[PDB]
Symmetry: C3
Subunit: 90 residues, 3 copies
């Protein structure tokens, strides 16, 4: 009966992203060094995980949002969220 | 009815931290290359996530502990755990 | 009643590993830059977390699989999964 979170970070300041699954919806809070704010990610899901990697100074984020046995991958690559190629046969 | 864990690591040896939420309490186990031991983190929460980053050789850890819809951020920056500025309106 | 995932990544292409706990079993999907495929990890568990680190170009993965209050660590160090030394007194 609690929310469920996932977190990732990059750099040294750092930048942080925290995803919260709450009543079937996943939202995103962001830190870039000067206060928390609400990010552009808002998608359905009961469970969330995240990973990210830098290429130079460019961040790439992958969020795995699951409802039932269906996991949807969401991708941030500098210019908006897009649905990723991830599949699994759960 | 199972415990729930979160893990982070840094360096090459490496150092590892594993957080376990169990019956509303989050505790920490630590690896620095020569055996597992119990860490200083002990806080209430039904759900845990973690991220960390290095600045040179200095580790910074953020633990997100949630009870109900309330997420509390805990910060390690070399000299003790402190409550962080994270908020969310869940 | 949803599956539960954990994710890690390394490099710049990148490589990604996504672990899914589903009905007491944890399986692994892999991305190395040219399509998702099923990995060698298949172990019992209701809950999963993961962390990984590079040593040069060599990846090291630690997966924490929990059933009830018992967490088992699984280790990938380039040549097969092995059970790790992790213990906790949950
Ligand atoms: O600057 C904030 C932002 O653009 O950062 C990258 C992603 O986390 C986005 O969802 C988010 O809105
Ligand atoms: O679209 C970006 C993408 O190719 O990045 C690597 C993996 O995350 C893929 O599933 C994903 O589709
Ligand atoms: O050396 C152990 C320790 O100081 O490492 C940093 C943090 O994980 C602390 O909670 C922990 O007690
Ligand atoms: O106190 C340390 C701090 O500033 O570090 C960056 C973010 O984790 C903040 O929420 C946090 O308060
Ligand atoms: O190339 C795939 C593979 O060998 O990568 C490392 C680990 O993720 C293994 O479980 C997996 O089968
Ligand atoms: O076997 C590899 C190992 O030594 O790596 C570091 C830690 O993950 C240990 O628990 C583990 O046993």
């Amino acid at each position: 009966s609690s929310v469920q979170t996932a977190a990732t970070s990059w750099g040294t300041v750092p930048s942080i992203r925290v995803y919260t699954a709450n009543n079937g919806k996943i939202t995103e809070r962001c830190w870039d060094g000067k206060g928390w704010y609400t990010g552009a990610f808002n998608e359905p899901g009961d469970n969330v995980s995240v990973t990210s990697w830098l290429v130079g100074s460019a961040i790439h984020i992958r969020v795995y949002a699951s409802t039932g046995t269906t996991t949807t991958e969401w991708c941030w690559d500098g210019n908006g969220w897009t649905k990723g190629a991830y599949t699994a046969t759960n």
